Design a protein around this motif. Structure first.
Motif: not given
Lengths: 785, 242, 49, 36
Positions: D32-36
């Motif tokens: 998922x392309x957000x906070x990691x």
RNA sequence: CCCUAGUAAGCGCAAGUCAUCAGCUUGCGUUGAUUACGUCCCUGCCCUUUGUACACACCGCCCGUCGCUACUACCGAU
RNA sequence: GGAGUAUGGUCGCAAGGCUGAAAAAUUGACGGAAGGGCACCACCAGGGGUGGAGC
């Protein structure tokens, strides 16, 4: 296709459900009917029985200041009010979810508090027939209620809760037992004290006295402990003298006297009873100097004890109109006038036409009873292995024979000619008794659970523990055939009047129909939710229905089946326990059914929305300003009389109401609704925006809809006149609110900068060396392309 | 459950030592492990017992002998009286809420450490509709308790204030009681605030950073609102012209 | 993941404790989490008697 | 035909083509392309 | 019951393509409008109330009847 | 002679009837209220068939 209906029901005095009442009458609970006895003569006065209800009754209460009205609480959650003058239910109350367990009445009797097992206590008015309100505390079930107004209750989460009633919320709580459960409540009649009986046999004692500060009403003045460590069922106070009775479900009732709390309370007497008492109750008789303690046992009896105040004597008892433990067998006469019922401990034979007992014998255990033809003598096969023989007309014991050694006679069948009887036992054998002299025995593989003959005395059928049935010939005992296919052992069987059908009731919850030529199963029919105890054919085909049969099972049901068309023709409800025995008439017109119940029975727009809310608030503002002028003129009684919607929503301000109706709508719908609002509705909105900015709440929402109002009506506002006044008010109020909020948040951010710099100065470094490389948040932020 | 030989089994008033230096107690009718004990050095050999009360004496190949006593009755009495005091003070909290004594309600909510009611008390006290004019939060008594808060209560209140400051609906009440907190206590106390629960994400630096950045966002919103709110003065000027 | 032990955080970002939460709100929070999860040989006497 | 439909629905096996991710090649884990 | 632009409708000419079609089928050109092109108010259909991205910005714990699981105590036969 | 591939036979197992037609679940079953999107199987404005006679 004639069905069956309940016509008679008897054999029961007080059930194992609670709450006996005295009035010199004793008012107790049979299963679904509340019945009132005289204690002096054993004839019952009356029964209160309702055709609409089937559920069992489990709480009784006498109204104070007016007897001959009573409140009963059933298992389904309903309450009925009965009269003792006329046996009808005047009002019915269906308020709770499950299982009313404790009733209470007001001192004036106009108000009724009922606490359930679904933990709600609901108080009820008795002149308006409306559920008044619903008091809500109590993690689990309420075990005690009393009216002190005030209410004092206690629950199974070991909490005493002292509720108010003028303001329907709890004033006090206290926890009676630390790690146990408070099980019973007893209040002094003058409201000086309350004693609560807990799980360990400890009786906690509390004193009562008769909101912004520390309110203290209940005080744990001390603990007491009784003799027996059982879960205590009740604590009952004397209404006149200084005594109380504490009892658990056991054979002792401990009467203590009122003169440390151990010095205040001393045990006056401990009363032993013959059976486990379920509910004690107090009785004061006019003209006696005694204490009439009326106990009502679990083992189906009432006892009136006399206690001398400053020893117990078994003064009165009611035991003749009921079996005392549990009926295991029934067998009804060839003349079908009288029947016999065989219970653990007893034989009691009854008349059908009068439903009143005639004869009584004592036996040890009674598995199987059947009388011999001529209905002069009866046969009982017991658990200890023996076969006893009694007679009706002289009411005596003739003979006793050790049929099997210590193996229970599970089956007894009289020959259809009437000269022999067969006893199949918990040993492997099954013995034949000719009259009695032993004629022939039958050794077989396992224990015989049930055997029956043929109506033309041609073939016999035993039913083993090996989940199988062996059908033999009657003359010589050669194996005619055997029936299989039962997953669990056969409990009963009944074969047809012409011997062309067998039904076979097993413990695997089904019955089988066999054809008895070749023994082919006609149809295995799964018909009960539990292990089907017994089956019986109607013997006469004089009425054209001889291939019909009844089946009684552990799921409290009888079922009337047709074996010719293989179809259930009726389902007979009405029993509240696992029905152990049943029998049909020789005429077949009625049947008796004896249960675990101990009761044997006989069967025969968004913008328009915010605009109308604006108008409601505007009328509220006009009424409130008129009431302000009136109360400024004089402090006389002036009611504002606002809208029922406001006094139902809880006397909220019109500002709060119109704020909620502006808050409920999603922001795009808010834009469209304020666009659809007309200029007749705009000035009321502007007054309410003034009210919001004055009593500041949702300042961004207020400014948002205010600037939308001005921008979508800018020419009309600068052409009108009264908007000058109300807009000047909203300008002053909104500017004050915005400047206040902005200055507070500016002080906050400046203080946070100062304390952050000071914390950095605290944090910086202590040591100094050559390596200042010792002196930041980081986020991850994945991205796919 | 052991890791070596057991070498001694003693009856209570059961216990078993090991050769894996652990001595563990459990009960027979249940049959699962109740407690384990880890004082000794390398080995463990034998166990003695006090015959009157329950006191275990464990010794082994190591020279130390450890004497243990049961405390289960004492901690059960402590947990019992703790639940007694808890239900009593929770009911007096509900009483103060129903009576409207916001002051002692707020004190008792800060003592009982559960904040879903504390937020409602703060929204009420900052909107009481009849505020005292000199008072910071509307009530002088709530001003007095916010002045007389202790260090751990101040730090726990700040740890709730960042969570209330996240929500833009409870942002005004969090900003107002934060204003009262800063006006009550000087900067040196809030900088030298030392509380044992300051580890990782809930330490004082990160707490004050979260509060500061969310307050920056709210302040930017209110500044845009004021600059847009001069439209009402423009409209009143036009009506004054007419 | 960054809440306290006794408390829960709601969808609003507000700490509410499980002790102060009533039974009805506990039931409703259980229903909402469940809605999200949905979106993603014996004796003869013992036989007879 | 009706009994075939009932058997497939009950022991549900359907021959519809399923929606696959457009970046199964380069991003096989589906992060998922957000906070990691 | 169907229909929103070379669409409705008129008109003829040609072919007869391994299934269908001469009681017709399918092409091909010609002439070519009225009125909607908005709204979910009615009738419905689909979907949100979990996820699938982060800044601005906005929202702010949707509700009921039961099941299942864990624990606690109750009831009464064996 | 070795390695594959087929074709048709032969044999062995499959090929012994407590029997007699019509569950899973901490993840499940069913709804309601609010808010969206779409539709000549919806509203709105019109147009055109079929339905009357005969083949």
């Amino acid at each position: 296709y004639l069905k069956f209906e309940p016509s008679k029901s008897f054999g029961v005095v007080v059930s194992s459900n609670s709450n006996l009442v005295w009035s010199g009458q004793a008012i107790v609970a049979a299963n679904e009917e509340v019945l009132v006895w005289d204690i002096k003569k054993g004839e019952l006065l009356s029964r209160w029985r309702d055709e609409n209800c089937k559920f069992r009754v489990t709480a009784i209460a006498q109204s104070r200041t007016d007897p001959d009205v009573f409140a009963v609480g059933y298992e389904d959650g309903s309450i009925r009010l009965w009269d003792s003058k006329i046996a009808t239910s005047v009002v019915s109350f269906n308020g709770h979810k499950s299982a009313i367990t404790v009733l209470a009445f007001d001192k004036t009797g106009v108000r009724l508090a009922s606490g359930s097992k679904d933990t709600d206590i609901i108080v009820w008015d008795l002149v308006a027939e409306v559920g008044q309100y619903k008091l809500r505390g109590h993690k689990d079930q309420v075990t005690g209620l009393y009216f002190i107004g005030f209410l004092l209750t206690t629950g199974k989460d070991s909490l005493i809760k002292l509720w108010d009633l003028s303001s329907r919320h709890c004033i006090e709580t206290h926890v009676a037992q630390a790690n146990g459960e408070c099980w019973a409540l007893g209040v002094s009649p003058d409201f000086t004290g309350c004693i609560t009986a807990g799980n360990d046999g400890e009786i906690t004692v509390w004193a009562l006295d008769a909101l912004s500060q520390s309110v203290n009403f209940l005080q744990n003045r001390g603990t007491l402990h009784r003799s027996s460590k059982e879960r205590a069922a009740e604590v009952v106070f004397h209404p006149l003298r200084d005594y109380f009775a504490v009892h658990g479900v056991e054979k002792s009732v401990e009467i203590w006297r009122i003169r440390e709390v151990s010095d205040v309370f001393v045990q006056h007497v401990i009363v032993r009873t013959t059976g486990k008492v379920r509910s004690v109750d107090w009785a004061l008789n006019p003209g006696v100097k005694d204490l009439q303690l009326l106990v009502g046992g679990t083992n189906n009896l009432l006892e009136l004890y006399n206690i001398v105040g400053k020893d117990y004597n078994k003064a009165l008892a009611v035991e003749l109109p009921g079996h005392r433990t549990d009926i295991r067998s029934v067998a009804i006469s060839s003349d079908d006038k009288m029947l016999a019922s065989a219970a653990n401990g007893s034989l009691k034979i009854w008349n059908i036409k009068t439903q009143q007992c005639i004869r009584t014998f004592d036996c040890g255990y009674a598995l199987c009873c059947a009388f011999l033809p001529g209905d002069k003598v009866v046969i009982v096969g017991t658990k200890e292995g023996e076969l006893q023989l009694y007679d009706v007309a002289s009411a005596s014991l003739l003979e006793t024979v050790n049929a099997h050694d210590g193996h229970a006679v599970w089956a007894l069948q009289v020959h259809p000619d009437g000269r022999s009887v067969v006893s199949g036992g918990a040993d492997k054998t099954a013995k034949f008794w000719d009259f009695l002299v032993q004629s022939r025995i039958l050794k077989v593989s396992d224990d015989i659970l049930s055997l029956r003959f043929s109506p033309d005395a041609r073939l016999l059928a035993v039913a083993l523990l090996d989940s199988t049935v062996k059908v033999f010939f009657n003359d010589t005992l050669k194996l005619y055939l055997n029936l299989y296919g039962h997953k669990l052992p056969v409990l009963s069987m009944d074969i047809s009047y012409d011997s062309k059908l067998i039904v076979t009731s097993s413990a695997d919850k089904n019955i089988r129909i066999w054809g008895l030529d070749f023994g082919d199963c006609h149809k295995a029919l799964f018909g009960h939710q539990d292990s089907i105890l017994q089956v019986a054919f109607i013997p006469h085909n004089s009425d054209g229905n001889g291939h019909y049969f009844f089946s009684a099972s552990k799921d409290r049901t009888i079922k009337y089946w047709d074996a010719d068309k293989f179809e259930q023709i009726q389902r007979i409800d009405g029993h509240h326990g696992e029905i152990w025995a049943l029998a049909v008439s020789h005429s077949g017109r009625f049947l008796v059914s004896a249960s675990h119940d101990k009761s044997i029975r006989v069967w025969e727009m968004a913008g328009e929305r915010i605009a109308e809310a604006l108008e409601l608030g505007m009328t509220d503002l006009n009424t409130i300003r008129e009431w302000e002028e009136a109360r400024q003129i004089n402090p006389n009684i002036a009611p504002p009389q606002r809208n029922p919607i406001f006094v139902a929503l809880g006397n909220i301000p019109a500002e709060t109401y119109v704020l909620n109706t502006l808050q409920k709508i999603k922001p795009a719908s808010l834009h469209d609704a304020l666009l659809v609002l007309p200029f007749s509705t705009i000035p009321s909105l502007l007054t309410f925006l003034n009210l919001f900015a004055q009593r500041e709440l949702n300042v961004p929402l207020t400014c948002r809809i205010l600037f939308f109002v001005l921008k979508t009506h800018h020419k009309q506002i600068v052409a009108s006149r009264t908007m000058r006044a109300t807009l000047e008010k909203v300008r002053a109020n909104l500017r004050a609110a915005l400047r206040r909020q902005k200055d507070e948040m500016g002080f906050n951010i400046a203080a946070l900068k100062v304390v952050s710099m000071q914390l950095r100065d605290k944090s910086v470094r202590e040591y100094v060396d050559e390596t200042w490389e010792e002196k930041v948040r980081k986020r991850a932020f994945a991205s796919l392309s | 459950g052991h890791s070596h030989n057991v070498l001694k089994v003693v009856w209570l008033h059961f216990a078993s030592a090991g050769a894996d230096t652990l001595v563990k107690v459990w009960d027979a009718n249940t049959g699962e492990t109740e407690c384990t004990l880890d004082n000794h050095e390398d080995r463990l050999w034998t166990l003695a017992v006090h015959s009157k009360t329950n006191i275990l004496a464990s010794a082994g190949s190591d020279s130390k002998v450890t004497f243990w006593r049961d405390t289960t009755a004492e901690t059960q009495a402590a947990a019992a009286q703790a639940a007694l005091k808890l239900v009593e003070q929770e009911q007096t909290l509900e009483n103060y809420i129903h009576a409207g004594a916001y002051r002692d309600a707020i004190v008792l909510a800060l003592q009982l450490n559960h904040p879903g009611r504390l937020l409602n008390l703060f929204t009420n006290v900052v909107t009481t509709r009849n505020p005292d004019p000199d008072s910071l939060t509307g009530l002088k008594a709530v001003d007095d308790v916010l002045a007389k808060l202790s260090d751990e209560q101040i730090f726990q209140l700040l740890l709730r204030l960042r969570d209330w400051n996240t929500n833009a609906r409870t942002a005004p009440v969090a900003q107002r009681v934060l204003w009262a907190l800063f006006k009550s206590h000087p900067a040196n106390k809030l900088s030298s605030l030392s509380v044992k629960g300051a580890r990782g994400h809930k330490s004082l630096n990160e707490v004050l950073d979260a509060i500061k950045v969310y307050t920056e966002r709210h302040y930017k919103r209110i500044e845009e609102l004021v600059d847009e709110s001069y439209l009402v003065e423009y409209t009143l000027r036009e009506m004054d012209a007419l | 993941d960054t809440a306290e032990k006794g408390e829960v955080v709601t969808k609003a970002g507000i700490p509410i404790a499980k002790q102060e939460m009533s039974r009805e709100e506990k039931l409703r929070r259980r229903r909402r989490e469940k809605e999200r999860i949905r979106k993603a040989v014996q004796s003869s006497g013992a036989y007879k008697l | 035909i009706e009994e075939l439909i009932k058997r497939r629905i009950l022991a549900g096996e359907f021959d519809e083509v399923l929606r696959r991710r457009p970046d199964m090649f380069g991003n096989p884990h589906g992060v998922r392309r957000g906070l990691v």
